[PDB]
Design a protein around this ligand. Structure first.
Ligand SMILES: Oc1c(Br)cc(Br)cc1-c1[nH]c(Br)c(Br)c1Br
Ligand SMILES: [Mg+2]
Length: 776
C-alpha cells in the first residue's frame, strides 16, 4: 500500500519529509518561543523569538539581535511547538493566530505541499509550478478514502463530496474561492477529472466517451473565454457553474455548463501588455496556409484588435500547439468540420471588421474610403458589403413613428462597429456553450455535484462596469461562506438550546452587498438602471446621482477628492475605485437593428443562427425597454445562489502566493491579507470552539448500539440509551452536549469515539467463535 510505503510518489509528493536527528533534538527541546514584530509599522513581517521569562500577565523574550521586549500575554502570538509545523490540519494547532497559521502554510508550501486543511474546508496556495499529484495513480489512491486516512488533496474533498451525495442522497456543490490567478480554474479541472474517472463507466462510449467529451469541453471554453490579463496569463473572463449529474445508481449520467457575465468588451479593447482571447491568437498563427488564404488572415500585428496592447505572445505557451488541442476538443464534442470553419469565419470576420476605418466626410457624417476590410468581413460572413456599410454609418431609426436614416460621425460609427463585434462574439460563446451542453446533457439526472468556477476578485488601474460585477460576485460568494460557516451553524446551536454563547466573528459584508444590488433603498445597480432609462441622462448625471445618494452617507462608499468620474466601494478584499465612463451604453447594450437585420440575412448557417435563434438573438423587455445587463445578471446570480442554497457546500479557498506569478516566493503581506478577508482563522475558531458533530438519537442506532452490554439498535427512547452507550465507556461528556432534537459532539469527538468501536476487531465479529459448536 503506497499510503504506507514511505517510498511512494504519494509519500514523496503528499507527505511531509521525515526529519533528521538535529531536528529531533530540537523537537524535544524545553524552550518556548513567541512570534513577534521587529517593526511595529509592518504587522505582517514576523520573527521567532524565545520566551525568556514571565509574570502572571506577561511574557518577556529576546529578539533575533539580542535585545529583550515584553508583552502582555493577551497580545502574545505564541509559537506552536515545532512538532506541529507541517500539520495537514490547522484545526489541531494549540495556538491559533495569524503568524502561527501562516507558518504552517509556509512550512508545507516550502515543501511543495500546496494543500492543508483548516477544518472542514481545504486551502490551496498556488505552486506556480507543476507537481505530479494528479496522475491516474494518485486518483486511485484517494478513491473511497475517509478524509483522515489520507493527506489533504483536491481529490479528497471531491471524493468526500461524492460519498456524501451517495449516502445522504442530497445534491452537493464545490465552491472554490480566490482572487485573480490563485488556482480556482486549475482546481476546478481536477474535481471533474477525479469525479469523471471515479464515478464514470469504464469507457463504454456513452460513459467512457461521454467522459472524454466532458473533459474535452473545457479546453474549448478556455480557448474563446480565457485571456491574458495583468494578473493571470489564463484569466477566466467569464464565470460558470458546471453540473455533474449522476443516475440513481451513482454513475455519471451527464453534465451541464452555465456560463456567466463574459467580459465581451475585450474583443475590441485590451489594456497595455494584455491579450485578446487566446482563440484569435491560435487560429491566426496555427491555421493552414490554405485556411489562411480563405479568411484573408495575416499577422496578428496586422489586425487592430490584436496590435494595440503590445503583447502577442505568452511566455511558455504555443498558440499553434494550443490551436490544435482546441480543434481536437471540438471533434470529441461533436462539432461538424463545417461548423468549426464558420466558427473561424466568424472569428476571422471579427478581426477584419476591426480593421474597418471610418473617416470624416465633407460633412460630419463619417465615410469609408477603403472597402478592403469591409468586403473581407462581409465575404467570410456571408453578408452583403454595401448593406453592411449602410448599416454601419447610416442606421435607420424611428422618429416618433417616422423612419429616419442616421448618419453617424467617425466616433459613433466606430462604436457601432464595436457593438457588432462584441455582439457577434457573445452570441458565439453562448452558442458554443449551448451547442456543447446538448452533447453532455441527454438523461434526466438523479443527483448532481455542482462546481462553481468564477472570475476572481481583481483590481486593475482602470476599473469599469465589468470589474464591479466581478467583485460584486466575489463578495456574494464570500458571504455565502460566512453565512454557512457562522450564521447557519450558530443558528443551529441556539434552539437545541445547547447553551451556546453567541460569537460575532466580525465577518459580514451585507452592507457592501447592499450598496450594490439593494432596491429599497436603491443601491448602485438600481440608480444605474434608472439612469439607463432616462432620455437626457449622461455619465456625469450618473456619478452625481450616485454621489448624491451615498457620498458621506454610506460607509462602504466614497466620493474621491481627486476625481469627478470615479467612486470607491469598500470590498472585503479591499477598496476599489471605479471609473464611471461608458457605464450607460455598457449597461444598455445597444446594437442597430439594421445590422441585426443585416446578419439574419447571412448565407452561413452558423452566423444566421446567432441572429435568428430567439434564445440567442432575443432579449427580454422590461416594460418599454429591454432588460439591462445589470438586471439580468443580478437575476442570473440570484438564481444560482438559489440553486446553491439547496445543496450541501464544500469550500476550497485558493491562495495566490505573490503578485508576480512566480514559484517559491510566498510573500507574507499578500498571503495574510487573503487569509484575513477570507476569514480562514475565523473558519477555524468556529470548528474548534464548536460542536460540529450532530445526529438525532434515532441514527444513534446506526453505529453506536451494541457499544455496551445491553442496548441494541432498538428502544423506545434512544435519548435514554445515549448517556449509557458512551458512559459505559465513560467518554468525557464535556466533549459533547445533548441539546434536544439531536445531540452534538465537539471537534471530531464523534470520530475518536467512532474509532473507539469502529476499528474494533476485538468483538466486532470474532465473538461467534469462542464456545461455538466447539462445545460438543
Ligand atoms: O452581444 C449581444 C448583443 Br449587442 C445583443 C443581443 Br440581443 C445579444 C448579445 C449577446 N451578448 C451576450 Br454576452 C450574450 Br449571452 C448574447 Br445573446
Ligand atoms: Mg478562473
Amino acid at each position: 500500500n503506497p499510503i504506507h510505503d514511505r517510498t511512494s510518489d504519494y509519500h514523496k509528493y503528499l507527505k511531509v519529509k521525515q526529519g533528521d536527528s538535529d531536528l529531533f533534538k530540537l523537537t524535544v527541546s524545553d524552550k518556548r518561543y513567541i512570534w513577534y514584530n521587529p517593526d511595529p509599522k509592518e504587522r505582517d513581517s514576523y520573527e521567532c523569538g524565545e520566551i525568556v521569562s514571565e509574570t502572571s500577565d506577561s511574557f518577556t523574550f529576546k529578539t533575533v539581535d539580542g535585545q529583550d521586549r515584553q508583552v502582555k500575554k493577551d497580545d502574545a502570538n505564541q509559537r506552536n511547538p515545532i512538532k506541529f509545523d507541517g500539520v495537514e490540519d490547522m484545526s489541531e494547532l494549540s495556538y491559533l493566530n495569524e503568524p502561527a497559521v501562516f507558518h504552517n502554510l509556509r512550512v508545507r508550501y516550502n515543501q511543495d505541499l500546496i494543500y492543508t486543511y483548516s477544518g472542514l474546508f481545504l486551502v490551496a496556495v498556488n505552486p506556480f509550478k507543476r507537481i505530479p499529484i494528479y496522475t491516474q495513480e494518485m486518483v486511485d489512491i484517494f478513491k473511497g478514502r475517509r478524509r483522515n486516512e489520507v493527506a489533504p488533496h483536491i481529490f479528497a474533498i471531491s471524493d468526500v463530496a461524492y460519498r456524501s451525495m451517495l449516502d445522504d442522497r442530497q445534491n452537493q456543490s464545490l465552491l472554490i474561492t480566490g482572487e485573480s490567478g490563485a488556482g480556482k480554474t486549475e482546481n476546478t479541472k481536477k474535481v471533474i477529472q477525479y469525479l469523471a474517472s471515479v464515478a464514470g463507466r469504464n469507457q463504454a462510449n456513452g460513459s467512457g466517451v461521454l467522459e472524454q467529451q466532458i473533459l474535452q469541453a473545457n479546453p474549448i471554453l478556455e480557448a474563446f473565454g480565457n485571456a491574458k490579463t495583468t494578473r493571470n496569463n489564463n484569466s477566466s473572463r467569464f464565470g460558470k457553474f458546471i453540473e455533474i449529474q449522476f443516475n440513481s445508481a451513482g454513475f455519471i449520467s451527464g453534465a451541464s455548463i452555465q456560463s456567466y457575465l463574459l467580459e465581451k468588451s475585450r474583443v475590441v479593447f485590451q489594456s497595455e501588455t494584455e491579450r485578446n482571447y487566446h482563440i484569435f491568437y491560435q487560429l491566426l498563427a496555427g491555421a493552414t496556409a490554405e485556411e489562411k488564404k480563405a479568411l484573408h488572415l495575416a499577422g496578428p500585428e496586422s489586425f487592430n484588435y490584436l496590435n494595440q496592447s503590445g503583447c502577442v505572445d505568452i511566455k511558455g505557451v504555443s498558440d499553434s500547439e494550443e490551436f490544435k488541442i482546441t480543434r481536437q476538443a471540438m471533434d470529441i464534442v461533436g462539432f461538424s468540420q463545417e461548423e468549426q470553419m464558420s466558427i473561424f469565419k466568424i472569428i476571422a470576420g471579427i478581426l477584419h471588421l476591426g480593421n474597418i476605418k471610418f473617416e470624416k466626410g465633407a460633412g460630419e457624417g463619417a465615410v469609408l474610403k477603403d472597402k478592403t476590410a469591409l468586403n473581407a468581413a462581409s465575404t467570410v460572413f456571408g453578408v452583403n458589403p454595401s448593406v453592411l456599410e449602410k448599416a454601419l454609418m447610416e442606421p435607420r431609426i424611428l422618429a416618433g413613428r417616422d423612419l429616419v436614416a442616421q448618419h453617424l460621425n467617425v466616433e459613433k460609427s466606430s462604436s457601432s462597429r464595436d457593438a457588432l463585434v462584441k455582439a457577434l462574439y457573445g452570441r458565439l460563446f453562448l452558442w458554443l456553450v449551448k451547442k456543447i451542453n446538448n452533447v453532455l446533457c441527454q438523461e434526466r439526472k438523479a443527483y448532481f455535484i455542482g462546481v462553481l468556477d468564477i472570475s476572481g476578485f481583481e483590481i486593475f488601474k482602470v476599473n469599469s462596469f465589468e470589474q464591479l460585477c466581478i467583485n460584486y460576485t466575489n463578495e456574494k460568494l464570500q458571504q455565502f461562506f460566512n453565512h454557512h460557516m457562522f450564521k447557519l451553524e450558530q443558528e443551529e446551536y441556539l434552539k437545541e438550546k445547547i447553551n451556546w454563547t453567541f460569537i460575532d466573528f466580525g465577518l459580514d459584508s451585507q452592507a457592501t452587498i447592499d450598496l450594490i444590488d439593494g432596491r429599497q433603498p436603491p443601491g448602485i445597480l438600481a440608480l444605474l438602471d434608472e439612469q439607463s432609462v432616462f432620455p437626457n441622462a449622461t455619465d456625469n448625471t450618473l456619478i452625481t446621482k450616485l454621489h448624491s445618494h451615498f457620498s458621506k452617507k454610506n460607509a462602504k462608499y466614497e466620493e474621491p477628492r481627486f476625481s469627478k468620474t470615479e467612486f470607491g466601494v469598500t470590498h472585503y478584499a479591499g477598496q476599489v475605485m471605479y471609473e464611471i465612463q461608458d457605464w450607460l451604453e455598457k449597461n444598455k447594450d445597444p446594437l442597430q437593428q439594421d445590422l441585426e437585420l443585416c446578419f439574419k440575412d447571412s448565407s452561413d448557417n452558423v452566423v444566421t443562427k446567432l441572429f435568428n435563434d430567439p434564445n440567442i438573438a432575443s432579449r427580454a423587455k422590461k416594460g418599454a425597454n429591454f432588460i439591462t445587463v445589470a438586471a439580468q445578471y443580478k437575476e442570473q446570480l440570484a438564481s444560482l445562489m438559489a440553486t446553491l442554497e439547496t445543496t450541501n457546500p464544500h469550500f476550497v479557498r485558493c491562495i495566490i502566493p505573490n503578485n508576480k506569478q512566480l514559484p517559491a516566493k510566498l510573500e507574507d503581506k499578500v498571503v495574510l491579507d487573503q487569509l484575513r478577508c477570507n476569514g480562514v482563522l475565523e473558519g477555524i475558531r468556529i470548528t474548534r470552539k464548536g460542536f460540529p458533530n450532530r445526529i438525532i438519537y434515532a441514527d444513534f442506532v446506526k453505529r453506536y448500539y451494541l457499544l455496551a452490554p445491553n442496548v441494541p439498535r432498538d428502544a423506545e427512547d434512544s435519548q435514554k440509551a445515549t448517556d449509557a452507550v458512551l458512559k459505559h465507556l465513560n467518554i468525557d461528556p464535556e466533549q459533547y452536549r445533548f441539546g434536544i432534537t439531536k445531540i452534538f459532539f465537539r471537534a471530531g469527538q464523534l470520530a475518536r469515539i467512532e474509532e473507539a468501536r469502529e476499528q474494533r476487531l476485538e468483538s466486532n465479529e470474532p465473538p461467534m467463535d469462542f464456545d461455538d459448536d466447539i462445545p460438543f
